[PDB]
Amino acid sequence: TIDDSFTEGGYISVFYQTRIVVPLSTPREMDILGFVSACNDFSVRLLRDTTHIEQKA
Amino acid sequence: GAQVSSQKVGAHENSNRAYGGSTINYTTINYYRDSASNAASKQDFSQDPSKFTEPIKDVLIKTAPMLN
Amino acid sequence: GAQVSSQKVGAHENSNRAYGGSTINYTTINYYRDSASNAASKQDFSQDPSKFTEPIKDVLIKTAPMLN
Amino acid sequence: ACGYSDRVLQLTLGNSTITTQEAANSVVAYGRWPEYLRDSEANPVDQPTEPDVAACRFYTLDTVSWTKESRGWWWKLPDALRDMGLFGQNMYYHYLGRSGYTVHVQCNASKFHQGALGVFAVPEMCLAGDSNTTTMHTSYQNANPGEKGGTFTGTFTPDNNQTSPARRFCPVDYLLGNGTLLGNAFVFPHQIINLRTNNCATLVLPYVNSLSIDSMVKHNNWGIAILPLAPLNFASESSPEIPITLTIAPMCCEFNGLRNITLPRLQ
Amino acid sequence: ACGYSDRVLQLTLGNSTITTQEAANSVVAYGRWPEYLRDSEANPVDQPTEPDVAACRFYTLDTVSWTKESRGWWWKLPDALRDMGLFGQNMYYHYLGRSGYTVHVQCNASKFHQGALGVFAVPEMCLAGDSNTTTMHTSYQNANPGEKGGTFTGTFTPDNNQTSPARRFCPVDYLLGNGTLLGNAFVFPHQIINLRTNNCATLVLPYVNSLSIDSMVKHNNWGIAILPLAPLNFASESSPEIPITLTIAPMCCEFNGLRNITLPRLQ
Amino acid sequence: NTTTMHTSYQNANPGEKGGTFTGTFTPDNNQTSPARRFCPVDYLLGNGTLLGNAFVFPHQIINLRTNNCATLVLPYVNSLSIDSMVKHNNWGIAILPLAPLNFASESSPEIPITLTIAPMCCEFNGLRNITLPRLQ
Amino acid sequence: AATSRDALPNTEASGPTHSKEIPALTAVETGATNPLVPSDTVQTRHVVQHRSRSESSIESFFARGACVTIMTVDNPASTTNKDKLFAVWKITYKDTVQLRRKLEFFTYSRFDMELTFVVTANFTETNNGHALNQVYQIMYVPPGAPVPEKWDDYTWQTSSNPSIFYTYGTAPARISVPYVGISNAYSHFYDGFSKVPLKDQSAALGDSLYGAASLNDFGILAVRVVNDHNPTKVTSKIRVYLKPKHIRVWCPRPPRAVAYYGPGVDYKDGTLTPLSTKDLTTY
Amino acid sequence: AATSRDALPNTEASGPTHSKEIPALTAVETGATNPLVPSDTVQTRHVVQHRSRSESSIESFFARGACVTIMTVDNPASTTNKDKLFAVWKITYKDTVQLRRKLEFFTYSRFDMELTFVVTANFTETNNGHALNQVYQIMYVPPGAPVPEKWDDYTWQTSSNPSIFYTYGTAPARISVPYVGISNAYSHFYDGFSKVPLKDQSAALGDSLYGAASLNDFGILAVRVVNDHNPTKVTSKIRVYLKPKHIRVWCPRPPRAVAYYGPGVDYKDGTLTPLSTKDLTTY
Amino acid sequence: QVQLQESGGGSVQTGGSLRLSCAASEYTQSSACMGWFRQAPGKEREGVAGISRFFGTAYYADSVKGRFTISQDKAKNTVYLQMNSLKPEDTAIYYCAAGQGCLTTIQALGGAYGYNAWGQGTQVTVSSH
Ligand SMILES: CCCCCCCCCCCCCCCC(=O)O
Ligand SMILES: CCCCCCCCCCCCCCCC(=O)O
């Protein structure tokens, strides 16, 4: 679950194949949304406390 | 009134005339009258995530077009 | 869900109407659900050292010449 | 064969019918269709009120406008229907009640317009308040704006008027006004009105609470959150606008503990 | 019923998948699917190299640009894949080899753009040279430009540098660079990327030669010719541009006569 | 003797030329730009364990009298089914003269040694772009 | 019939394809997540899976106790000016954070609570006097019952209030309580209030807190040192740990992203920055 | 079907011989050890063997706990200048030596670890003040979880980290943990690194330690005295003992001959002298 | 990651004091010895200072001992670097360096090898203006 070399996962990358093409009277720039999820064969183990939450004093 | 359950064996002892192979089971005995007192059985069930993943009224055929 | 095993009797008590002779066994009961919690059965198995001693492709006949 | 499509739909509840040609199918929250209260699950003893078609039909709220600077919009149920014909009347006169709803948000544009709108149904949409001095400090009036609903903001503004505080919500958009990233919002039953593909979003929500029936006057079971995921742009203009409209319909509407009229202070 | 269409397609070779929505079906050259070398047809004795997914997957070449003044574009196989991961490596180390390919050219525009592109697969695409002094005079380097491929011209230009000739091809477009009218080009397995209808052209080519296997280093079995049949125009602009991209995948890739690395002089 | 597990990737993996063992430990005292290599003492089989027990590993002895070669078949051995061969070596090949090399009565004899290796049941996954490691 | 510890489906061999079946392309606007496996997009091998979701079942995820509060009591001298300290604490999961957020992954839940009581004690005055082992009585005072006012009043008699008698130096105290909710499940988020402000009523008479209800009022825990006044003062802290066993949950919610601020959903200024810095074109 | 405690084969009677069967002569260069018995070279009698290899089975050889580390924590006065001491220790078998070498007879191993916790405590300042029995919480912080910075920070709340609450003066603490390796077995020797230094990358960006990997990162153990600041300081040490039960091993290696020097295989100068003096012609 | 965000680029003269700090608030397997690396555009990147996460294992480069010291706040979480009596030879871009699993800075003691999270970089010039 940590950032580690031995257990590195790889790289994800998006590139233009052609390019975005629009006619006239059409917004030349647009956006894209991205989603990520697990597949039916995804599993996790070793329960630990998260670090994305904390109480100061 | 003992409750004998199985153990999904992980690491195996070089044994199969006691441990290792031949189905290793455990015993549990409820000592209290109230269910609230019992320990967690941990023998739970799974389901299909659909009710969260495919909460769509119409059947989703992954190979077909989502929109048709 | 008890696990009753035998004891290889070493020293013998001048007894055979209780101890000594008539097969002395012991009981074991698994109290936990996880195999990791169990005690060591110690009822293990032996093998043939060959995979270390005679890791040779061709069969070694001790009475014959090693090199032939 | 006959040309049946998931984009083209028509739903009918009572004397009201909705029709569309650019749908993206239809969502049934948690896979559960709305239903009447079962005997095995019941609790109030009195014979219940089932208004049927009277209350259970489509109801159109007040239309809002989508522009480049809008941060989002919100509504609660039943709240957003408090003054809708019979249902509301039936709400104000009975101590308890339950209901499901088919929410249909409308918003079409052009094949030359772009943008994506996240329509999220959040059960127990308890929003965040505006004060850094006092918690859970939003008053009933400000909590329940009714049919007009409310909006989200892009910047938190703590009320510093300690003399007569505002006592309202200050729901930050990216934290989906609840202190949780909007990104995970997809955990809730939802749809996306992405102009390219669709002009509407239809969600069917069953009655959800910790109990069979509750006081709809005191408690909102479902929230309706609509936030632009992608921005609204058209051609090359600077300030485009496209209207958004919500029509809501109760389903399996029932009420108990009939009594005298409730006259709440809404302002 | 389920909405299955010949325009919407997805092909998968290895760890690579191509997807499209504006296809015009798919062409299988001469009706023959690529295959491995049969025992009844075999000739080299050594046990062959079948790289599989290693070599047999989609490979994207360098994108070129389509404009009003482009005369056409060309590539040869295997040549155009000589430096593509494993396949190329496997090509350079073995004396012989055979392979089929699924060529997929990409080029989408708008419903406001027009033009037609002829994608022709020409087995044994022996192009014409540039000299009027010496025949079959094009050098290996100029013959095989690899992945970048080459282009066609609208005017024949004979090289008059007799001191150090250019030794290249000068393929006239209308004569499909071979001395034969482009019009008949349709005799070869082909497709047309007519902007209105389609954004891509997919052709499946089996291994074609006069023999079961050959030295891919010395000989190209298939050529890829892409020429605008209709001109590229958009709205009313003067210099429009639309990119064209080719992704190629070997199929049933096999090689024999493994030996030391071949280091050809490419320049 | 200053830093442990300090040998760099380059020095660890000499490739085909391989490396050698030494009869005397020499600690690098260049603290400015250390050598970062191995210093494998022969009698400790470069690992801190007597060469004598080396026979616990699958092995053979090229005793000139009898044999001219040694052939060993090694299966894939790791803590897992497959691993990154670029990052990790599964097997090592150690060749040490147990008895000394002598010929007739000459002072400096020489005899060549050659190793030919063949992979077996070779398989790979996770195909991607070329790895260009820094070997020097 | 699929248990928590059963193996997930094996991934099967799949070769090349080129047709009209479209796995890769869908539409998320519909609200449905494409249920693809590797074989749909890539060529895979036959693989006998062995891993199971044994460790992520609701039961297993909450199969742990968490410090919910830290209570403070003492036993000073008889000559003291300030009265002996007895602690009172309302039973909630929302004083701490860790446990709260876990609970907050969901909207509703049913569980039987197991409580443990670790007790610590220490001397405070730099002296050389002595203390005799202490006994602590932790009484549970449900809403409605009389809450102690003195360390020595009539309440600590406990005729019907559950009370624990813990001797110091022994196994921490542990009890069990069933699902005690007034609702059919414990609600973690309430979108409402308790009272309805009516038109013909004073605003004051009609106000209530947002998200506050009885759904969550479980009374208080009262504790004292049973020992009578000791010459040299001794301080003590009871750490309570809650484990929700035999648990069931409903309606997933996104996890708290900004640090909590009160028992509600409210957040403060300058805490609203959970994500760090990261450029779009770098790994 | 031969168990660990079964009798080894009996040695049988054998008389004189003179033929062409050659037991005594072989060739070790082949890599095979001649499997001879006494009867092959000498004339023996019929002997019913009774001894068994019961005590040398892998299980039995490791059927013992070994001190792996010694942790140090304290509870000083409130007036102190230096902060109360809490110990953090990364879980490894390689701080000590005895256990390590045993493990090192092999290249790989699978086992479930049983840990015990013997706790000692003592006064340090020559005074006459007093302390009240201590409780120690040993929390297991797996890689990724927040590691305490203070003896009193939010981490010690333990919502999902396994933690032990040990009262001083009672049975030492003991837990069990399954085979937790990221690999299919725990690797004792790794012939590699973690990162691959690439050509188009800075040497700094590509370096890693030789033989170092995640295969061995199990997080840390954190411990403190639960008791609040006491007037007179008290020192304490937790000795951890590891027993690898239910053990399996692979690939025998020669045992460490030179004293260890770091977690690797490295050795230092002047330690490389394991064998003493002994003349070739003397018994 | 951890958070590593550094600042402190003051071009002081030869013989002045300068303070460098790097954030390490989030607690992953936290920066053990930590790490400070300077890249002189004439030379390259090199290791300099480092004190163990918990322990007092502070390594000092030959060139900076005594003058340069490392210390941090085991609570406020930020790593300080007192650099006094600055020579003109120390003009380089500094960087903080998280070495996770403490053993990463116990085995090798010094950083460099066991370092996964890289800092931003602050330009420090020590000149004769
Ligand atoms: C003497 C023992 C005490 C017995 C009484 C315990 C009182 C029951 C309180 C249970 C509810 C705790 C609140 C957390 C539930 C939630 O997360 O909503
Ligand atoms: C609170 C109890 C702690 C529970 C977590 C224990 C962590 C598992 C660590 C096991 C590995 C120990 C390292 C020795 C193994 C080896 O010899 O390679």
Side-chain angles (χ1 to χ4, degrees), chain E residues 5 8-15 17 19 21 33, chain G residues 16-25 41-43:
Chain E
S5 61
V8 185
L9 68 70
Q10 59 289 67
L11 309 176
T12 180
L13 295 169
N15 296 339
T17 301
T19 62
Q21 297 192 36
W33 194 273
Chain G
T17 39
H18 75 93
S19 294
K20 43 187 166 59
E21 50 181 346
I22 66 167
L25 289 171
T41 56
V42 293
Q43 301 187 212

Side-chain angles (χ1 to χ4, degrees), chain F residues 1 4-5 7 25 27 39 41 47-49 53 56-57 59-61 67 78-80 87-89 132-134, chain H residues 29-31 108 183-184 187 190-194 196-197 199 201 210 254-258 261 265-269:
Chain F
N1 284 192
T4 54
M5 298 184 298
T7 300
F25 189 89
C39 199
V41 168
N47 295 353
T49 186
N53 289 340
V56 299
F57 298 98
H59 69 282
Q60 282 182 332
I61 305 172
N67 50 7
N78 176 29
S79 57
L80 280 166
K87 297 184 180 182
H88 184 256
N89 296 326
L132 304 74
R134 179 185 294 265
Chain H
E29 315 70 56
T30 57
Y108 307 106
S183 300
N184 212 168
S187 296
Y190 188 82
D191 183 352
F193 292 78
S194 61
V196 173
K199 291 179 64 62
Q201 185 187 15
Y210 175 80
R256 183 65 182 178
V258 175
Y261 201 92
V265 62
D266 296 357
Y267 55 91
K268 186 191 176 183
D269 286 17

